[PDB]
Symmetry: D2
Subunit: 194 residues, 4 copies
């Protein structure tokens, strides 16, 4: 029974990826171009998310700040989910909704990029992070799922949404991780060739 349940999970994950391969590629490519153009212009990338998505935020920032595959220079990315003093104080002093937006308002420079990760598209703090990136004239790459939630209504024409065609948070995170490896691979290829 457990073996069957595991297979069923592997299979659902495989199917979700096959469904995502049918619609995500163009958005994944557009998002990598948005990020490469920012990196080429002294810009940096900020990432935020909650739970497994906070793990994706820092997964992305480490691939860039250290490396993805080939040896190359560190690239500028900052995860907004890791400084516990900043996060706890903001949430404590005002509200949890401001933990990312408040850092973006300080760190965001025009032309920088915000990688906003949410499987529901409905996390208040990421919705507010997107508003704050817009206030700093930043472009937004949003990794989402379901119907895109409030995050999708905030996206502007230059922003890019990568909406996983799934309603299951765990499946969604699995594609998000793959999507991030694609972005890291495409950024390296674009900046340093194949």
């Amino acid at each position: 029974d457990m073996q069957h349940r595991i297979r069923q999970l592997f299979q659902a994950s495989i199917e979700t990826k096959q469904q995502a391969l049918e619609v995500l590629p163009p958005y994944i490519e557009q998002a990598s171009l948005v990020m490469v153009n920012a990196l080429l212009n002294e810009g940096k990338i900020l990432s935020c998310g909650n739970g497994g998505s906070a793990g994706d935020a820092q997964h992305f920032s480490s691939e860039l700040l250290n490396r993805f595959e080939r040896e190359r220079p560190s690239l500028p990315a900052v995860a907004l989910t890791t400084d516990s003093s900043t996060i706890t104080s903001i949430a404590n002093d005002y509200s949890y909704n401001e933990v990312f937006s408040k850092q973006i308002r300080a760190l965001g420079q025009p032309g920088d990029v915000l990688l906003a990760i949410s499987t529901s598209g409905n996390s208040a703090n990421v919705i507010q992070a997107i508003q704050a990136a817009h206030d700093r004239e930043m472009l937004v790459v949003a990794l989402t799922g379901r119907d895109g939630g409030g995050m999708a209504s905030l996206l502007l024409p230059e922003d890019v949404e990568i909406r996983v065609p799934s309603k299951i948070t765990a499946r969604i995170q699995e594609v998000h991780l793959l999507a991030i490896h694609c972005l890291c691979d495409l950024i390296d290829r674009q900046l340093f060739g194949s």
Copy 2:
């Protein structure tokens, strides 16, 4: 050299120095009781969980790292865990439920009878820490509360076996400075009591 700046810095140093002098007059008894609660917990194979917000979250992990690595003398690592460092845990709990549960949910899972909670707050009024204390009580843990001002809601929740180290100040930055020194004192007393000398 600029007028206001050199004056201001001197004024801040003096206020930090004076605050420690007042604290020196009332905190020693509490700092000692608190180190004994911690030492007993450690001897009984228990562990210490710490929590706080902002500068206090910095203190929570400063404490944890002093024990897990070392304070001064070379000795084995001691069991402490700061409840403020796992961003996935913290963000998912706050995002799914409420920021008020970030520490308490971890304590309910991790806390064991006889463990100790180091609850840090300069006002004594942070809801998450207040809920952490209630969770430590529900897990039959003792609480060492580092506070300031009038103790706030944290103070009224403390039980007879708990220990409060209330800094005699209303200024958060002054209270944090004294909390850091108090933590260095607890680490020092814990080594003294556990390994002697």
Copy 3:
């Protein structure tokens, strides 16, 4: 639309999909044994410690947060602790001694007989994780190792009661993708076994 980019993305998706298909053929038995080791530890009031480097450190805290908060079903928080999140602890241990001791020193302090170590490495060759396994053994803990390639030095250290989930791939990013899914499977099996349904 650009030639190479759309081709490359498709190629990466396919390689991720194929890797999962190969993993689907060999990992289920191990994933199940590993969930049973974890479930037994949790039932016996033990806890799970997780560690790893880079993407694997992300996985270590993803695992910890799934248990401390929730995976899918509403249920009480479960005891897990990622050994990779406390920066004060990690930096002081690496700075004073060696980066190789960052996990092992925490395990020696925190680990208890019957606890479980989730050791994550795509090569199986990270020294700190290798030393973490040796420390879990010294604390009479069982080890669940998420690896890849040929298992590396981590594989040769495993004992008969330990469980290895070795992804059939040599590519780190592919192995991490399968490690994430494996973790979702363990969380799913842990809830199933602990609360039924």
Copy 4:
């Protein structure tokens, strides 16, 4: 006996502060001006350190990104000690000595400031962080103790050292924390008046 030991610690801490008040103020002021000038020119501040010093690094970044005392806008600071994926991968892949320097090379922009914290002045990774800030044309504020170690030999004329007159790490960290509150207070006063 324990009461006496505690008093002795409080007293040693008080004395160390009194000794620091005799020599630190000019450096503390110079460091706040260096930081204010960077913030006034779209620059940001990066902080790093180990152990209690990593705690100071993020203490500083939170005071700026959230707030110190008065309500004011978030200021740009990034602690390089908090993203565990970045830190572990760099140390794992190369060596622990590169955990900060590698992030500075990516994130550092000319005119930014590095707050490098070390009670000994001799931590390899902070020594290397200072070299990397110099490569990015950044100024350095170094919080140190003892004789300044390798960090002090790397400082350039525009950099500022705040060397606590103590050899005891715990005393040194106590002054560092006070020094950081001074910097936060001076930055607020300079930027938004008294």
